[PDB]
Design a binder for this molecule. Structure first.
Ligand SMILES: Nc1ncnc2c1ncn2[C@@H]1O[C@H](COP(=O)(O)OP(=O)(O)O)[C@@H](O)[C@H]1O
Ligand SMILES: Nc1ncnc2c1ncn2[C@@H]1O[C@H](COP(=O)(O)OP(=O)(O)O)[C@@H](O)[C@H]1O
Lengths: 100, 417, 100, 259, 259
DNA sequence: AGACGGCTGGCACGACTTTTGCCAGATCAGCCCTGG
DNA sequence: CCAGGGCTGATCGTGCAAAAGTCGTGCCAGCCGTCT
């Protein structure tokens, strides 16, 4: 697909050195990148070595922390577990700052 | 007459931006449509064993290298070898020219003779003569391998050498006078040549998938067979209730408005997609009614038709039917076809009747195939055969059709009995 | 395109097809060892352009034109026995019935 | 370089000199106008006028003021663009536009409605014309040829014809000699006619002319020069229409009684 | 606008005042009427006068009063808008709107139809003009140049010319002299054209004229002014056919019989 | 060995299909303001 | 407190026609089979 899962221009090339587009398909090109398709002409195995990233503009916590036997965010902020679990779901409205 | 700028009357036409979008909506395939429709759904907020088997396979090219590894050679010989067998097809002859491969090496030391060597070393590997670089010699290599003892060997070797043109135009009269071979004994040399496996690489890859999704379905329940659309395929939008119950009680004008506008959109889009579907079923249905014929009968029994034929059975305009037919495939007992397909040109037969070209072109294919192989039927001879049937096609029509079915001429399909 | 059992398998010897009948199934009562072919099925390949190479190959040999692939039912390795009986079920609408 | 002689004969007298005039006219790209009696072979020498000249491959298209019609007259000359006026489904090329790089024949100049002359008055000078109901203009270089039945100069005094129009045309004139001015070529044109007609009716051969014919031929005034002469001889031949003794009677007039 | 250089061969007393008269007028916006006798050289002045004026890159656009069709007359003069009538498909720019900031040079207006006189007059004096079916009035300055050989003062009395149209039209009318009147300038022009003609017909050069020829051509009614001179020297040159001796043959009238 | 007849295929020219491109407007009903 | 007037917004609308495309059949050129 285009700009998605199992897509081109991400995660590497396809089964052969040939570009998805259709041009620049041979061993003569080793590191060049075409204009109609942006795909590095390399081996297929490198597909299992290239990962992807997602922006996720909205912040998101890691469930491995603050949900195990010890609470990391809890021990860092001196905050109980119930309050953090209630504030990580838009139903607590904790206060950030304000000294006046 | 006279020239002036007067006014006429009696007509009907109306359109708008939003309605337009609703109309183009049915012209594009569900799969490609559902994409367009997913995109709508981001914009509108109120509208809603790990490796299993994973058996890595052989792959031919992969097979070629496994023996490259246990062939003995140098680094330069193993480098050219990877180059050569890199550039080889599923069929098995090589894609690039050999002088091209020299440009891929980029080495002054590398020479054509050196390449001729590594190539030919790996040219008799597995299976026989693979990496051919333009068949003629591939055949020549497989000939090469087996024993002198088999008769007619030198004959097949002479022909294959430099008399290819003679065999491709099937002009055996010329072949006989050129090669000065035996009369109707050469036949068996040619038969040897015939059983030599052209395209020896193909063999490896065979595992090919099943893949086609029928839009509509039509299937012989007691006669009068009935069309129903594909349930799984058909796209569907459903109103979000949460957000529907959060427009009224809303305290702000921003929010309230916001929610109304979207609901408006959304209800409209639903109604438009709903439309697409109904059209297409009404229409499916109306095309197979007329073309009742065809399912049982075959491609021969198709009546010749135009959109008008199917548009006037419905109440919609012609263009509309034209937009809804593109890229929809409807599955039936007989197979999967595109909905376009039914529609074709007619030609006028004897007895006032007309015949669908498709059906005649199916007819020509059976007739031409089922003929004495010593004497091929020429086009005009057929025209005459059809005329007996009543079709009265003419000869260029039939050439056209006969060359469309990817079948070459009569003088060109002539062969030894 | 549809797949049919016509015993017209390319890239195979006559010895293998010596036990296959017209439609492609094996005669009742025969024996089979190793990886012999039982039912000869082929898978169609997509049409191509003029293709001067394939055009020449079809003008010379013919009847194949790389249209079908060898996808015949063969016995798995390490299996030896004799066939008791065959059976064929065809859906409604299709009336090929070579030897059914 | 093709001669295109076609049916050219009757070369005995002065006519031969006018051939010898118009003969280098084609190379020149100027106004050219001819004057002759109706049917004094007024077309055939103006057609020849195009093939001989440079663009001998230029498209040939031709019009007459006598026909044309009062209405579509404006549209037919300059031509009309599409949608310019109601009922105009597609753009239609103008008559002037039709022939570009080719000579256009003009006839019945002697008549010409005051309306017709004015519209084409500036079309042929700077070679510029704009289609009716057209946003833009077009430029062409066509070689106008005119032909008349009558005396243009006398008409100019009366005013049934503009001086300006006269000036643009008539670079050189060419007066075809009246056939009855000939006296020589009667007989060769004669004989040619003879033979054609005998040929068409699938008769074996031509017998001759029987002097009485010859005598009476000279006497007639001959109003249409090569156009009643041909016709006369076809219509006389048909009355005989055999292969024996030559024909003696002259069907000068077909509304005369058989008896 | 700094340099303009084409034609205008004549260099005589009369042609001097008029040429220098054009120069004064060209800067000024006001419309100028070009009157005269046929063939004097009006398409010269009007073209050249247009650009001497301060608008030269602006569109310049001609027509013929007589040429435009009577039925579409409103559209030719002004134009339409898409949807106005069964025939039209889009807004139509008109000659009056085609001429924004440029100049409109009517040609041979003296023959313009009765309707034509009653169309352009109101929109010319002011610049107000409503497009056929247009919602609002369209306003434009199109410099006006128009010229004709007729005599308007004589014509207005007859009643074939609207009165005032001759009147809000005529500021600084320009009058050219005839060929017979210049006399001194005639010799230079003959040499020019000839050399031009002879060069056109793959000829080397000019022989020059003789005293006979000089005298002959000098004294003439010289009717068509410039149009006729060039005709004559340019027909005579064709007939001479060579440069071996001086040119002597004069063809004045083409039309009375060559022996 | 040369001419004649047959074959095929390219290209052209009407008769005929089909495919893409439009872009609101007026009219009716409920609620709010105001007169009776 | 009840009836009259204004005004906004909500609602209804899948075709007509213009140009590009395909269709069938004829015309003509070039290759090849066969008799004299
Ligand atoms: N010298 C000539 N030799 C042969 N035929 C001639 C000659 N002059 C004229 N004709 C013939 O005379 C008849 C004259 O045609 P003409 O009357 O001039 O046409 P138009 O009426 O259109 O000017 C023609 O059909 C033509 O073939
Ligand atoms: N001084 C001049 N210089 C060059 N050519 C001239 C002159 N006077 C007249 N002419 C010519 O004769 C013709 C001009 O037409 P013109 O007098 O426009 O006719 P009208 O006045 O009738 O438009 C031209 O072909 C132009 O060469």
């Amino acid at each position: 697909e285009r700009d998605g899962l199992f897509c081109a221009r991400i995660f590497g090339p396809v089964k052969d050195y040939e570009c998805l587009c259709g041009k620049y398909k041979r061993l003569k090109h080793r590191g060049v990148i075409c204009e109609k398709c942006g795909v590095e002409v390399t081996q297929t195995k490198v597909r299992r070595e290239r990962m992807g990233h997602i922006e996720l503009a909205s912040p998101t916590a890691h469930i491995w922390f603050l949900k195990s036997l010890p609470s990391r965010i809890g021990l860092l902020l001196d905050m109980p577990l119930r309050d953090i679990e209630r504030v990580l779901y838009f139903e607590s409205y904790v206060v950030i700052e304000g000294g006046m | 007459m006279k020239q002036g700028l007067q006014l006429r009357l009696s007509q009907q036409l109306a359109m708008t931006p939003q309605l337009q979008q609703a109309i183009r909506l049915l012209q594009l395939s569900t799969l490609e449509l559902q994409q367009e429709l997913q995109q709508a759904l981001e914009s509108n907020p109120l509208l809603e064993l790990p490796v299993y088997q994973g058996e890595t396979t052989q792959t031919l090219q992969d097979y070629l290298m496994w023996q490259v590894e246990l062939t003995p050679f140098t680094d330069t010989d193993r480098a050219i070898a990877t180059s050569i067998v890199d550039a080889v097809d599923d069929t098995g002859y090589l894609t690039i020219q050999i002088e091209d491969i020299v440009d891929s090496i980029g080495d002054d030391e590398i020479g054509l003779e050196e390449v001729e060597a590594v190539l030919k070393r790996i040219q008799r590997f597995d299976p026989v003569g693979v990496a051919a670089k333009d068949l003629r010699d591939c055949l020549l290599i497989q000939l090469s391998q087996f024993a002198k003892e088999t008769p007619w060997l030198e004959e097949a070797r002479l022909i294959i050498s430099d008399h290819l043109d003679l065999l491709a135009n099937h002009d055996f009269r010329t072949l006989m006078r050129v090669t000065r071979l035996k009369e109707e004994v050469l036949k068996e040399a040619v038969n040897l040549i015939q059983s030599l496996d052209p395209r020896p690489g193909q063999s490896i890859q065979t595992s090919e998938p099943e893949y086609v999704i029928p839009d509509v379905l039509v299937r012989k329940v007691s006669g009068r067979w009935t069309v129903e659309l594909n349930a799984d395929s058909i796209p569907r939008l459903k109103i979000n209730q949460q957000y529907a119950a959060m427009g009224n009680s809303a305290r702000n004008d921003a929010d309230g408005q916001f929610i109304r506008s979207n609901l408006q959109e959304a209800r409209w889009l639903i109604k438009s997609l709903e439309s697409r579907n109904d059209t297409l079923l009404r229409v499916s249905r109306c095309i197979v009614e007329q073309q009742q014929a065809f399912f049982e009968q075959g491609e021969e029994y198709m009546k010749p038709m135009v959109l008008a034929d199917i548009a006037q059975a419905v109440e919609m305009h012609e263009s509309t039917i034209s937009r809804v037919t593109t890229q929809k495939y409807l599955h039936s007992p007989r197979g999967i076809f595109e909905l376009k397909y039914f529609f074709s040109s007619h030609v006028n037969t004897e007895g006032g009747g007309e015949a669908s070209s498709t059906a005649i072109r199916a007819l020509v294919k059976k007739l031409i195939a089922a003929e004495n192989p010593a004497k091929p039927l020429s086009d005009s001879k057929l025209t005459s055969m059809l005329s007996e049937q009543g079709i009265m096609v003419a000869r260029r029509t039939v050439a056209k059709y006969r060359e469309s079915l990817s079948i070459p001429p009569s003088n060109q399909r002539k062969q030894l009995v | 395109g549809p797949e049919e059992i016509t015993a017209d398998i390319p890239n195979v010897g006559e010895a293998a097809l010596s036990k296959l009948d017209e439609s492609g199934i094996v005669y009742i009562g025969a024996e089979v060892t190793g990886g012999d072919i039982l039912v000869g099925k082929v898978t169609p390949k997509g049409e191509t352009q003029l293709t001067p190479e394939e055009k020449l190959l079809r003008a010379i040999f013919g009847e194949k034109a790389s249209d079908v692939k060898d996808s015949s039912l063969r016995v798995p390795n390490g299996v030896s026995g004799t066939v008791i009986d065959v059976q064929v079920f065809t859906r409604d609408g299709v009336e090929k019935d070579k030897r059914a | 370089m093709a001669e295109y002689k076609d049916n050219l004969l009757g070369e005995a007298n002065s006519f031969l000199e006018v051939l010898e005039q118009v003969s280098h006219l084609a190379p020149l790209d100027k106004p050219v106008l001819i004057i002759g009696e109706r049917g004094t072979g007024k077309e055939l020498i103006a057609s020849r006028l195009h093939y001989l000249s440079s663009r001998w491959q230029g498209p040939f298209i031709s019009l007459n003021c006598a026909a044309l019609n009062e209405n579509l007259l404006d549209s037919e000359l300059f031509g009309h663009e599409a949608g310019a006026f109601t009922g105009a489904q597609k753009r239609h090329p103008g008559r002037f536009e039709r022939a570009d790089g080719g000579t256009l024949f003009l006839d019945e100049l002697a008549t010409a409605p005051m309306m017709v002359q004015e519209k084409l008055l500036r079309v042929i000078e700077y070679g510029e014309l704009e289609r009716v109901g057209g946003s833009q203009p077009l430029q062409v270089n066509v070689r106008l040829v005119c032909a008349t039945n009558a005396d243009l100069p006398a008409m100019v005094n009366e005013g049934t014809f503009r001086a300006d129009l006269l000036d643009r045309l008539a670079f050189d004139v060419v007066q075809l000699p009246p056939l009855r001015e000939r006296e020589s070529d009667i007989m060769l044109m004669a004989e040619y006619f003879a033979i054609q007609m005998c040929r068409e009716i699938k008769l074996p051969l031509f017998p001759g002319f029987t002097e009485r014919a010859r005598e009476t031929l000279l006497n007639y005034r001959w109003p249409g020069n090569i156009r009643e002469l041909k016709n006369v001889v076809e219509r006389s031949v048909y009355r005989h229409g055999t292969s024996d003794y030559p024909l003696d009677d002259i069907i000068i007039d077909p509304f005369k009684r058989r008896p």
